[PDB]
């Protein structure tokens, strides 16, 4: 029986995994060894502490992360969702629209 | 309060959809997804009222 548990001890190496490249300033999909999310990973300006990996904010959501290999701090940001609106003079005069 | 209501088990295995989806198969993760759906829907209804 292989015995393991989650959220019982902080980890930095964990179990098996492979490594790929790193990209920034693009809304990409990432998985930093158990930390899964989607966003834009710009270079961070915050000052961390040597034992202090993650980062959060008031609402307790991820806002920064440390590189497992190069040990540098880079931000996380959702990639610009929003809504659209259609402006029309009416079908009755014309048919052009303007999308906002 | 509405924002902080997101992180709640609501009597499920976990409060994050990704963890449930990746760690569990659909046929028995459906109940956990339904529980989270009900909880978040109720919270949003109360906020709107």
């Amino acid at each position: 029986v292989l015995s393991f548990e989650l959220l019982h001890a902080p980890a930095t190496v964990c179990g098996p995994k492979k490594s790929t490249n790193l990209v920034k300033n693009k809304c990409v999909n990432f998985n930093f060894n158990g930390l899964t999310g989607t966003g834009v990973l710009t270079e961070s300006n915050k000052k961390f502490l040597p034992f202090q990996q993650f980062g959060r904010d008031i609402a307790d959501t991820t806002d920064a992360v440390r590189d497992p290999q190069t040990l540098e701090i880079l931000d996380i940001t959702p990639c610009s969702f929003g809504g659209v609106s259609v402006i029309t003079p009416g079908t009755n005069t014309s048919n052009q629209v303007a999308v906002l | 309060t509405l924002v902080k209501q997101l992180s709640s088990n609501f009597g499920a295995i976990s409060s994050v959809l990704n963890d449930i989806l990746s760690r569990l198969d659909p046929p028995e993760a459906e109940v956990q997804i339904d529980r989270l759906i009900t909880g978040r829907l109720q919270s949003l209804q109360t906020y709107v009222t």
Binding site: A59, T61, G82, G83 | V3, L6
Partner: peptide, 27 residues
């Protein structure tokens, strides 16, 4: 100064003091 704000309006605006984007929220 800002063209149309009188001194009392300026005092009122400075006296009243209060928002990062989240999932689904918009203003």
């Amino acid at each position: 100064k800002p063209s149309k704000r009188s001194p009392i309006e300026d005092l009122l605006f400075n006296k009243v003091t209060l928002a990062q984007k989240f999932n689904g929220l918009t203003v």
